[PDB]
Design a protein around this ligand. Sequence first.
Ligand SMILES: CC(C)CCC[C@@H](C)[C@H]1CC[C@H]2[C@@H]3CC=C4C[C@@H](O)CC[C@]4(C)[C@H]3CC[C@]12C
Ligand SMILES: CC(C)CCC[C@@H](C)[C@H]1CC[C@H]2[C@@H]3CC=C4C[C@@H](O)CC[C@]4(C)[C@H]3CC[C@]12C
Ligand SMILES: CC(C)CCC[C@@H](C)[C@H]1CC[C@H]2[C@@H]3CC=C4C[C@@H](O)CC[C@]4(C)[C@H]3CC[C@]12C
Ligand SMILES: O=C(COc1cccc(I)c1)Nc1cc(Cl)ccc1C(=O)O
Lengths: 555, 150, 49
Amino acid sequence: SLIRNLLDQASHSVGHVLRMLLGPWSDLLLWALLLNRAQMAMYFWEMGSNAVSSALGACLLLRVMARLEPDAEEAARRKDLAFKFEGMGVDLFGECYRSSEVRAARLLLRRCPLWGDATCLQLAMQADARAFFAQDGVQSLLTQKWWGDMASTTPIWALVLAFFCPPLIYTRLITFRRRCLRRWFHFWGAPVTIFMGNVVSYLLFLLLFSRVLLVDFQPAPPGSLELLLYFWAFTLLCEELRQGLSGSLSQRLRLYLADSWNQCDLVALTCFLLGVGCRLTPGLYHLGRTVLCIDFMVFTVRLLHIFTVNKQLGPKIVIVSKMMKDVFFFLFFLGVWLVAYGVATEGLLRPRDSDFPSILRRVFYRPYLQIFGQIPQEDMDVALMEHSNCSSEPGFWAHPPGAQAGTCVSQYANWLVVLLLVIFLLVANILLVNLLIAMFSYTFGKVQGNSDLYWKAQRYRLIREFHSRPALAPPFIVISHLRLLLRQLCRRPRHFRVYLSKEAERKLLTWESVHKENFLLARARDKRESDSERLKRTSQKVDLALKQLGHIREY
Amino acid sequence: IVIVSKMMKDVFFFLFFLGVWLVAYGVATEGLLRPRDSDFPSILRRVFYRPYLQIFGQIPQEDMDVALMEHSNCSSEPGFWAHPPGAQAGTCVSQYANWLVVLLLVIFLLVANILLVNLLIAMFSYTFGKVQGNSDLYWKAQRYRLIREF
Amino acid sequence: KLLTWESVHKENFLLARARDKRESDSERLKRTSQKVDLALKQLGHIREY
Ligand SMILES: CC(C)CCC[C@@H](C)[C@H]1CC[C@H]2[C@@H]3CC=C4C[C@@H](O)CC[C@]4(C)[C@H]3CC[C@]12C
Ligand SMILES: CC(C)CCC[C@@H](C)[C@H]1CC[C@H]2[C@@H]3CC=C4C[C@@H](O)CC[C@]4(C)[C@H]3CC[C@]12C
Ligand SMILES: CC(C)CCC[C@@H](C)[C@H]1CC[C@H]2[C@@H]3CC=C4C[C@@H](O)CC[C@]4(C)[C@H]3CC[C@]12C
Ligand SMILES: O=C(COc1cccc(I)c1)Nc1cc(Cl)ccc1C(=O)O
């Protein structure tokens, strides 16, 4: 199995868990989980302490072991145990939140001594406990943390007005949980305010980049505006580099190459560096301008991910991410039909200007544009063209008026050319677009129910990442960077983690144990009231009656 | 009627996505081709209005493709320009990267006119199917209030 | 060896499906009905007492 060999390898030497494990109920529970004893795990859980934290840790280790399983059956057993176990854990935490909201809220951030001193939230995220993030209790607590010391009942427009007018903080609007200085730091350190500052800074960055690209990008040496834009770009590069380094050196970069949004930011920044180099070098000014235009497109795309936090939009964004397979199949089919129809028409009518770019244009671009209402009838039908004799080759040609429709086409089979145009319009503009409608509707209907749950996890990760992000905006985050490097240089000569009281820890443990035993007795009553169990009981009672009646049959 | 009132969230998300993609594509084309008439209203028109109208069958090929335009030498700046015939398409654009301009036009048409409209179809159908069953009940209450008010 | 393995797994599958059928509520209600009927019959066999 994966227990004896794992212990032998650890002795011969998740890795921290293996190191700490070697050959009060925590040890029994962990042994039950590693031995794949489902009933032992359940019972040790239910009669042991720290049920929620133990549940998150144990389901994390179940997922890890199922991934490590070389046997599909054992992996399936471990993973189904993990699903049932995370579900029952989240049910317990839901019934806990149903009792005392603030008690459960401070139960979350409780740094439990076991499982590597990691909070429940980090354990769930490492375990991919989407269901354990789904419940309204943890959702509301995450919302309040995103509104850290801001009384989340405040509306968004109040927040934007307060951001625009710093004096507005000391008003009746926007309540909150050196008083002026403390309020100032709370306002400017709240993760939601950090997010708003980042959004406004990014909008200003895009506006300035567009202004530079459309007006101030002459081949003259860079001006003050160009230098300032370069300064913002370098600051963003430093920001992303530090974020990747913080969130072991090579292991961290291998971790960072994931999270495709960071990949998009990285490729955008590399394109920016290439564009700056080409702009600075004399010869490649035009190439620099083109690549910077492409980079603007990439940055505008990244703005979407920056604006995925909205409660009504994130599921839709992950939906449109999921719809790529359907659009991609449609791309194949459209390409095939476009090749067929374009080559057919390019063979039926033979323009004199047979240059390769012109042939490729007439075979791909124009048929593609026929889909969206651009139909050059005067270019590809003879009855709309004036007849003339071009070449010595025997035929009737009727030179067109179009600039890139050819010098003059042939006309032997224009009836079948028009027939092909009709067929192509019927297939591409009717069969394909409406069939893509069908696939899009079906995919949305199937996927939305899991997309919203994935958005819950994504929003938790978003809250964590903006909490980890420093205070000042990217245009001024150079101050934060120099502050952190000074802190790095200060030690050379030398995550919410809300504190809980020591007696409060014991009171939370007792409260959680009491509510756990209440939930178990409730579920036991439910199982007893279940019709199948009742029929079981009736069957046994009837059997006992029959047996004891047989014991008096001799009378 | 109460359904179409409820559909505003979907149309509103679509408005966000269309605005983002329009900004991206418009600025890309406005940077790739550089009309001489760089007045602010003209720049804003070319970056927002014309790309928006490209969705509904208004494609100024003769305005933004060089192979359809007559070539001429406008300015001392080194390049080939090929002055357009359009009235508000610019005095004369540059032509260094019109292949990629046409590629961007193709990509924008594929995304906005195919991905977005059909995806909005999907959301509209799903929202209608989900909401009609309560919308009719709300209409019952609304009609009672209507009777009372008249 | 494949024949023996297949036969063993086949009889395992049949016994599993038999247990499933027995645990089925309809079959259980059948069994309860027959047990109640037998109890009634043998109680009638001692009615004369
Ligand atoms: C926030 C982003 C996405 C908006 C994109 C719109 C862009 C194209 C707009 C917004 C601000 C605009 C600039 C604002 C002011 C001027 C000064 C004027 O004398 C020349 C044009 C110029 C430089 C504008 C060009 C177009 C512009 C850059
Ligand atoms: C739906 C899909 C299959 C449609 C594909 C259309 C693409 C491939 C078409 C549309 C416009 C076309 C371009 C139009 C003009 C030029 C400039 C020329 O100097 C090189 C070829 C090039 C760059 C063409 C290559 C093919 C092209 C990019
Ligand atoms: C809705 C669908 C069915 C419409 C299809 C349009 C068809 C019927 C049209 C398109 C072009 C037309 C053809 C154009 C030219 C010719 C050549 C002539 O010597 C005989 C008539 C003939 C052959 C026409 C008959 C009708 C025609 C084939
Ligand atoms: O959805 C996302 C979110 O970032 C995006 C990055 C680029 C473009 C878009 I629109 C969104 N990225 C993913 C995209 C794919 Cl095609 C597959 C998986 C993921 C992922 O989230 O891992």
